[PDB]
């Protein structure tokens with residue numbers, strides 16, 4: 001959609017690039033909300049209305065084709081990100097799910113480079129990504145996410161998408177969702193927005209999930225028909241890594257009887273371990289809390305390969321069929337090597353209550369506990385804070 005006249009004021013976020021020899025050196029980044037989270041309205045001199053909701057093509061009246069859509073639908077800048085529950089403070093990003101005044105912005109943001117006109121492209125195969133988190137205000141059924149998508153570096157800036165990454169265009173993920181704009185262009189044919197997606201962190205105070213998701217396409221792929229479905233071009237489920245799913249129940253939770261005590265802050269380390277040829281083989285997750293390294297659990301479950309890392313053997317074993325079929329750990333590594341955009345969000349699940357994250361085989365949460373009607377009784381204002389985003393050499397990102 002065409003940029004409007006309102007000023008876009010991106011929050012500044014200091015991050016780090018890490019080496020063994022040089023330590024953690026600070027870098028300037030900016031934060032941008034998803035393009036379709038910006039106010040989108042019909043152009044000056046057109047009757048008021050919308051340019052499409054999540055799940056829909058754009059409207060036939062103002063968007064019969066890409067060129068009409070590009071002039072009739074206006075994306076306004078957001079001059080005050082706090083109205084959408086997005087604030088930064090030095091090296092800290094705070095995402096508020098619900099504001100004090102009752103609004104539910106459920107924000108999703110991307111990391112821009114210091115120009116504000118191109119995503120920071122992370123190339124993590126053979127490297128580590130680390131962050132500090134406060135998960136205390138995330139009950140059952142909340143998802144705090146920190147992940148990568150294979151979005152176009154400029155948000156697919158183009159003649160009819162002049163806004164680009166500066167307005168957060170070009171979002172995609174392994175769900176192949178229909179959005180009224182894809183690559184900042186009217187999705188006239190109502191296709192899905194597919195790409196490789198690496199879920200570094202999907203967690204609340206009750207459960208922690210890591211999951212790579214493969215697609216058999218490079219970059220953002222516009223899917224039609226069966227391509228968007230479970231047997232299509234992307235892996236919707238991913239290869240899930242969660243202590244609970246591998247029958248380890250005392251690793252992560254609220255209080256001193258868990259190794260990672262989600263009542264206090266902690267650090268999350270993710271290593272992308274490659275072979276001599278630069279192909280990804282293992283994803284290693286471990287934590288640091290109160291100045292001490294908490295090594296990963298080993299799997300503890302009959303029929304599951306005994307491992308402390310994600311790899312092809314574990315993924316095949318645990319039923320991740322589309323993950324293996326659409327490129328497996330090597331394919332995921334190739335997307336990570338091409339470069340990905342960092343996305344950070346907070347959301348809840350009216351339909352499923354996020355049961356796949358923290359319920360049953362995945363955690364300690366009862367049926368219905370994760371329903372939004374119950375979340376607000378446990379925590380009226382859910383929020384997450386990510387602090388000191390930092391990536392670089394294996395073993396360089398953490399102290400003690």
Ligand SMILES: *[C@@H]1O[C@H](CO)[C@@H](O)[C@H](O)[C@H]1NC(C)=O
Pocket residue numbers: 089
């Ligand atoms: C920034 O964070 C620190 C907590 O470290 C707090 O002292 C400070 O008041 C915060 N700044 C703003 C503007 O909220």
Ligand SMILES: *[C@@H]1O[C@H](CO)[C@@H](O)[C@H](O)[C@H]1NC(C)=O
Pocket residue numbers: 247300301302
């Ligand atoms: C699950 O965990 C406990 C180990 O504490 C063990 O008794 C049980 O056999 C394990 N179950 C499976 C299905 O591996």
